[PDB]
Structure 1
Amino acid sequence: MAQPVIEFMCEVLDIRNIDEQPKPLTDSQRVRFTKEIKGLKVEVTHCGQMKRKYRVCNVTRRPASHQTFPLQVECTVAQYFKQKYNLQLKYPHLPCLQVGQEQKHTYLPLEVCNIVAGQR
């Protein structure tokens, strides 16, 4: 089974009350989380059965609420999932994952991500 990256995060940062502390992440926490998620493979969950897979290459410093990107004029990733997918993010305060080629600057909210377990 695939594990939600939110849960993976809470495990990495030793959190149990993620829904009690709507607090953003400390620089210390982000760095600790980034080390663990960087390089893992993830699958999108907001597109039904179109579970597109991505390679996490980094973690943003800005929350999904503020992370911006070149939308075809700049937009907020949180807006995106509210406008295009009509889904208010549960954690707009947590960072987004950067997936794919660096220069492509693709950001995904942690909420919509599941860690893909290897199948050797």
Structure 2
Amino acid sequence: MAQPVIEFMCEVLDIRNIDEQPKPLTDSQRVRFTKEIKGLKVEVTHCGQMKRKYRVCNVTRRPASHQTFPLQVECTVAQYFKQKYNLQLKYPHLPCLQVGQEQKHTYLPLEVCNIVAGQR
């Protein structure tokens, strides 16, 4: 089965009450989490059966609530997911996973992400 990246994170950062503290990650927490999530493959979970797979290439420093990209202007990913998918993010304070070609600015909220299990 696929493990929610949120859960993967809580295991990495040794968090149990993820929803108890709506506090942002510290630089120390972001750095430890990035080392672990970078390089892994994730599958999206907000597009029904179109579970697109991405390669995590980095973690943003800014939270989903502020991370921005070139929108055709520039938009905040939280809005985008509430405007294009009508999804009020549950963790706008946590960062997004940057995926795909660096020079492409694809940011994915942790919420909609599951770690894909390899199948050798």
Q: How many pairs are equivalent?
A: 120
Shift of 1:95: 0.2
The equivalent of 2:43 in structure 1 is: 43
The alignment partner of 1:82 has SS state of helix
Distance in 1 between residues matched to 2:23 and 2:5, nearest whole Å: 17
Superposition TM-score, scaled by structure 2 size? 0.99
- Consecutive unaligned residues in structure 1, runs of 5 or more: none
Instruction: Name the % identity.
Output: 100
The equivalent of 1:108 in structure 2 is: 108
Shift of 1:10: 0.3
Shift of 1:74: 0.4
Instruction: Summarize deviations over 1:72-102 as a string: whole Å, max 9, x none.
Output: 0100000011000001000000000000011
Superposition TM-score, scaled by structure 1 size? 0.99
Q: Aligned Cα RMSD in Å?
A: 0.3
Instruction: Summarize deviations over 1:3-22 as a string: whole Å, max 9, x none.
Output: 00000000000000000000
The alignment partner of 2:90 has SS state of coil
Distance in 2 between residues matched to 1:3 and 1:55, nearest whole Å: 15
Distance in 2 between residues matched to 1:81 and 1:96, nearest whole Å: 12
Distance in 2 between residues matched to 1:116 and 1:44, nearest whole Å: 10
Shift of 1:105: 1.2
The alignment partner of 1:33 has SS state of helix
The alignment partner of 1:59 has SS state of strand
- Consecutive unaligned residues in structure 2, runs of 5 or more: none
The alignment partner of 1:111 has SS state of coil
Instruction: Summarize deviations over 1:20-53 as a string: whole Å, max 9, x none.
Output: 0000000000000000000000000000000000
Distance in 2 between residues matched to 1:84 and 1:102, nearest whole Å: 23
Distance in 2 between residues matched to 1:36 and 1:72, nearest whole Å: 32
